[PDB]
Amino acid sequence: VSLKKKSKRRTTRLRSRIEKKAAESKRKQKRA
Amino acid sequence: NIPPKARKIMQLLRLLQINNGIFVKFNKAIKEMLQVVEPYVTYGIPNHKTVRELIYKRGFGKVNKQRIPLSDNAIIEAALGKYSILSVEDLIHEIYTVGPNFKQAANFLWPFKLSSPLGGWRERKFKHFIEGGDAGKRDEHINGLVQKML
Amino acid sequence: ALKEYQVVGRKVPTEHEPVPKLFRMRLFAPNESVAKSRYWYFLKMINKVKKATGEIVAINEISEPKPLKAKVFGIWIRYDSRSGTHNMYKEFRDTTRVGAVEAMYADMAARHRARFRSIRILKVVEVEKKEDVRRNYVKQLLNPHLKFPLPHRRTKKVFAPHRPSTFY
Amino acid sequence: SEFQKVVVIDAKGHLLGRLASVVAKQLLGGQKVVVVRCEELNISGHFFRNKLKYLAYLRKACRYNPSRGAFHFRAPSRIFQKAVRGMLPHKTARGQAALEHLQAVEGIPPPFDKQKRVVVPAALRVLRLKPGRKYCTVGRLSSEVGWKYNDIVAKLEERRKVKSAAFYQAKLAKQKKIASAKEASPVNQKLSQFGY
RNA sequence: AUGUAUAAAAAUAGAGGUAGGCUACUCUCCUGUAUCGUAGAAGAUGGGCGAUGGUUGAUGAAACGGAAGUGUUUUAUUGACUUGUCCAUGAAAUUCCAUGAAUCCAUUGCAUACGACUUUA
RNA sequence: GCCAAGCGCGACGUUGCUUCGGCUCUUCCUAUCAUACCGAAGCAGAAUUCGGUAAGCGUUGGACCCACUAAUAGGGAACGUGAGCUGGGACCGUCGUGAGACGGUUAGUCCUACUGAUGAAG
RNA sequence: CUGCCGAAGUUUCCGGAUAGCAGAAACUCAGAUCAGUUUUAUGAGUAUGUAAAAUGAGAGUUUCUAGUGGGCCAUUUUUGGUAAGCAGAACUGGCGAUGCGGGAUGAACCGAACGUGAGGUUAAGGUGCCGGAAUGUACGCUCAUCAGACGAAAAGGUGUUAGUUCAUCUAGACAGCAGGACGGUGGCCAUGGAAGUCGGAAUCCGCUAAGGAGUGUGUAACAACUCACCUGCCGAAUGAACUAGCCCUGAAAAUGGAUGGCGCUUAAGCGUACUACCCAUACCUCACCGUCUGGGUUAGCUUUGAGAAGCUCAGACGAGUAGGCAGGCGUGGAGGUUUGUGACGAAGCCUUGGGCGUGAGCCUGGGUCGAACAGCCUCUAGU
RNA sequence: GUACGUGAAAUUGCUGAAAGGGAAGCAUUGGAAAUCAGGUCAGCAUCAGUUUUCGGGGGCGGAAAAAGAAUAAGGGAAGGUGGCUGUUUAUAGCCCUUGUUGUAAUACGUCCACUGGGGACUGAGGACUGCGGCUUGCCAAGGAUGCUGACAUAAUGGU
């Protein structure tokens, strides 16, 4: 089928927090 | 999803609907206003065919606050005879050459209600014309767009 | 479809500079509007000449003088990458300067995933002597006895009756 | 281009999904499709990768009556039918009627060994895979995951090839006689102006 | 359904032959837009000329097909048709598209919550 | 701290002493105790030690032990399995200094999987 | 039942007022004033504030009367930070009162804002099949025994592809064969001993084409082998350090499972370019409904079309919570009216009968039924 | 028929018709079957409105395209041909410049109040006015007519 051990496609909550992770990276670079 | 600043500017340009076109006299105040709403409109230099075909096919006059079609020369004479604009060709000449009464001629014209462009836009329509999109200034390519919307 | 455009421009005349210097660039763009935009970008980044203070005095498309003569073109470019600072030199064999630039843009976006705005072409030259060629694949093209079987042949009318020949 | 009421497709040398995608659309179009030699189908990717793909598929099972779990079919025709079935709206009555118009078999049984077998150029491995790319055969993949009739199909196919060759020689010999007698009639050169 | 027309095999960095002695020949491929078939009041009625074939219907067969052989031939007849090449009649106003067993009732206990199961009659 | 490829930091190196808690049960994970097979080591042999593949199969009986044992490996089912199972008050009032007690209200909330059994019917 | 208008979503003072947003009433105003806008000029610090052309729109006030006074999400600036989260403001946005196309599915993503329809064309996203639409065109990259389609980070890989720099190269490039790889010297200490290679310090030398106080194996120690470096045969490119792309790694356990699936490998993956194509309630044209706005309409002209509460022409518009306004449908009873309906069948009821209205509802055929009931105008309510 | 006027719905049995692979109801579009009202439905032509899809011809523009071809000068050479690894058109040729044929062509861009076809949807209004064109009249000019068919013992429109 896929041979992977995890679903490559994540959940909508998981991708939503990734944009939050991208927000954190902007916080680390710009201000933090 | 329009910022209030752009919404006010396009209200002054009378661009209250998508695919609506108007003629403007290009000057300092117009040039910078078009810069602010540049992502939301595309503008260019129209040639004589574009101006003539717009007024013949999509030309409507504002008479008694009513969108009256430019079906007869008497309509233009009754509304713009004070400025010696007696016929459609006189109205085209005033718009094309930007005569002394351009403001009265353009404000008399109802904004052109263009259709969707036959053949479509570019793939990403909301990028600048330079960046492969359709927004912003596009010089003489406004003509090719207009023949798509006529 | 890219086009080579000669763009000559200069700042608006003023009392301090009544005879401004006219700067010319040979730059490629799909249309004149893009070319004049790219010209202004390069002029600002080099001479610090503001677009408002300047003006475009001449725009002219340049056709290939010998579109039927196969040539080799060497292109120096300023590649923009993750670090955003890299210089590259590439050589393409074709009959038109526009074609070589088009191949250059396709190659860079393919190998290095570099966009049109990130890439800036520094100089395009025609390497007429075989010896100055630095690329082995190009040199193999300039060999006198170049001959090779056609690669990547691969050839509605669904449901063909017989099997494809896929050969000579 | 044009249809046939019943179409026999020689699956040898084809690609699983590419042939399945073409077949599924043809079934929806109201055509009847018979796919022969499903054990000779090819799949892009080396055997071990494709074997692991099948093993992962076999792994799907319930803790309550694995009979309620997915039924994993090992026959090469059943593997092809699974590929076609996933490309059809099979939960829908239209897709169900599409499936009943498909008949995928291993080898070429008698009712079809005497019928013409067309091929699909959009799915042929030689026209779709870069040379030097690893690929596997469904017959080998099936025989290594549980299919137990590879040899019987192989033996039966060898006999059919012998009988088919004998038929061709008789047909070829007959065609030569008509070919020789063709130029005997003068009319073929009298009015060959029409391109015939 | 509207011709419900078409059976080599394998290769694709090669095949198939013809003509030869696994080796010397040359030719063909480059898809089926091919080949077969196709004139006739859904296909009428006769007459020639020239084949001496083709297409079949009904019998009589013998050989072949087992993977799902339900079809392939070879035929011995008989009945038709033949457009292979020419002729002569007929056509319409439809006067502008529409189409013998098992079961119950009994019996058994190798079986059994009840059905079922195994027996016997 | 010393260096310190490099881009004032500066990696590896180097110096400095210093309520919870457990029975049964079901499966599953391998981060493997045993069983099977390999690799390394002064591995002579034997008994080992360490490291790989590996969850197929096991991983007890009694009170820190104990003996058996090939071995008595670690965990999950986020309130593991308490709907398999058991063990180890608040408000108000009153008297009140630095301090604690003597109350009135109070407030809880078929269907289907599985196991077998028949069974009409192309 | 239908139609029309339609917020606030919170300041500013003490739960109330003021104001804001929405209407109504009554005024004055079109040689006038406005504006979520941009220029020009002045100064002052690319911005700022003040004043004076562009564009658009008829612009103003007074009374008085409803509803509202939350939040959530996101961008940017900034204030601190902390293993890491984040925390505090401001800012205007989006939701909120709002359907629709796409994103497999979705409060916050991409498009787009809504009367009923016909046609055309698009946005966003797409064109292998599910699935409407190119198994399109062109140029590349990628093979994963856990590909891809969407922090764990410092790095590792004899994985591939382009480059950048520096090196040698007919004085013969590497690589491979044939060799040399020496003499003082076993240089000096050390000990069963170490003669380059137990070890500790030196690291000199003559000869060359070149040979170290030795690259490792070896030896009890030599010896022997080896390379550092040279020589010959051979005949051309070769090596080192970096950059970038893609590929593997750069941990995570506990029924089977997910680029949505099937599947896909010169893609149906990734990047780019170019055409064509698919369809939203969006855009265009048209018809119709409604609302608003503007114009016209009496010696009532033989065009007869004056229920003036009527007729007619034209244009624009159509989501809608709180709230506001208007017009209608239906029921019991009352006054009036219809020369009203009715045992030749009232009312009621039933019905895969018909018709009208956007709708509330109304009319009617057939059946059953057996004594009363309805239209219109007004009144009334236990509607 | 006193389980007694009328006799609704829920619900139940029966007969008829149909549907039914782990829900059903509903909406949209039609088909089938049944049943209702009872002019209908077609084809073409000539026009109007909107629209889509193929062509043809002709202006103008740019390096007044670039090329190119043919034909005269000169220059250079190769990925070196004939010749003899090395050379300079010979028994192949190529590159560069200039002249010429020239006002070459063509592509691309743009325009035509230039033109020829194919397709689809729509037909609002209802004496005459108006703006125009051709010449009292006629007209593609303030919104569709004409010519035929077939079919009513059915098509259409329903339910």
PDB file of C-alpha atoms (C1' of nucleotides) in Angstrom, chain C residues 1 79 81 86-90 106 109-113 115 135 137 152-154, chain G residues 134 136 139-141 161-164 243-246 266-267 270-274:
ATOM      1  CA  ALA C   1       8.639  33.168 -25.079  1.00  0.00           C
ATOM      2  CA  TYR C  79      22.435  32.508  -8.803  1.00  0.00           C
ATOM      3  CA  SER C  81      20.083  30.162  -3.451  1.00  0.00           C
ATOM      4  CA  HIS C  86      26.337  32.441  -5.873  1.00  0.00           C
ATOM      5  CA  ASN C  87      27.958  32.906  -9.283  1.00  0.00           C
ATOM      6  CA  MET C  88      27.589  30.342 -12.073  1.00  0.00           C
ATOM      7  CA  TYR C  89      28.815  29.926 -15.640  1.00  0.00           C
ATOM      8  CA  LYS C  90      26.982  27.709 -18.123  1.00  0.00           C
ATOM      9  CA  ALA C 106      14.635  26.095 -17.599  1.00  0.00           C
ATOM     10  CA  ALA C 109      14.736  26.171 -12.302  1.00  0.00           C
ATOM     11  CA  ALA C 110      15.111  22.425 -12.877  1.00  0.00           C
ATOM     12  CA  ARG C 111      18.464  21.701 -11.236  1.00  0.00           C
ATOM     13  CA  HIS C 112      18.611  24.470  -8.629  1.00  0.00           C
ATOM     14  CA  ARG C 113      14.908  25.463  -8.392  1.00  0.00           C
ATOM     15  CA  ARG C 115      12.917  31.508 -10.025  1.00  0.00           C
ATOM     16  CA  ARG C 135      31.960  21.691 -21.032  1.00  0.00           C
ATOM     17  CA  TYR C 137      28.982  17.498 -23.250  1.00  0.00           C
ATOM     18  CA  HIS C 152      13.849   8.866 -25.892  1.00  0.00           C
ATOM     19  CA  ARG C 153      11.825   7.935 -28.977  1.00  0.00           C
ATOM     20  CA  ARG C 154       8.725   6.325 -27.380  1.00  0.00           C
TER      21      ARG C 154
ATOM     22  C1'   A G 134      -4.657  17.403 -22.625  1.00  0.00           C
ATOM     23  C1'   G G 136      -1.008  17.850 -23.750  1.00  0.00           C
ATOM     24  C1'   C G 139      13.450  21.315 -21.135  1.00  0.00           C
ATOM     25  C1'   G G 140      15.621  19.053 -16.790  1.00  0.00           C
ATOM     26  C1'   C G 141      16.044  16.468 -11.978  1.00  0.00           C
ATOM     27  C1'   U G 161      23.591  15.815 -11.094  1.00  0.00           C
ATOM     28  C1'   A G 162      25.305  20.417 -12.278  1.00  0.00           C
ATOM     29  C1'   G G 163      28.798  24.080 -11.054  1.00  0.00           C
ATOM     30  C1'   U G 164      32.910  27.292  -8.113  1.00  0.00           C
ATOM     31  C1'   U G 243      28.370  25.213  -3.409  1.00  0.00           C
ATOM     32  C1'   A G 244      23.520  23.752  -5.043  1.00  0.00           C
ATOM     33  C1'   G G 245      19.457  20.289  -6.394  1.00  0.00           C
ATOM     34  C1'   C G 246      17.168  15.606  -5.625  1.00  0.00           C
ATOM     35  C1'   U G 266      11.546   8.877 -19.553  1.00  0.00           C
ATOM     36  C1'   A G 267       5.154  10.182 -13.464  1.00  0.00           C
ATOM     37  C1'   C G 270       9.600  17.732  -8.167  1.00  0.00           C
ATOM     38  C1'   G G 271      10.916  22.694 -11.075  1.00  0.00           C
ATOM     39  C1'   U G 272       9.981  25.823 -15.264  1.00  0.00           C
ATOM     40  C1'   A G 273       7.872  27.502 -19.848  1.00  0.00           C
ATOM     41  C1'   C G 274       3.757  27.267 -23.428  1.00  0.00           C
TER      42        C G 274
END
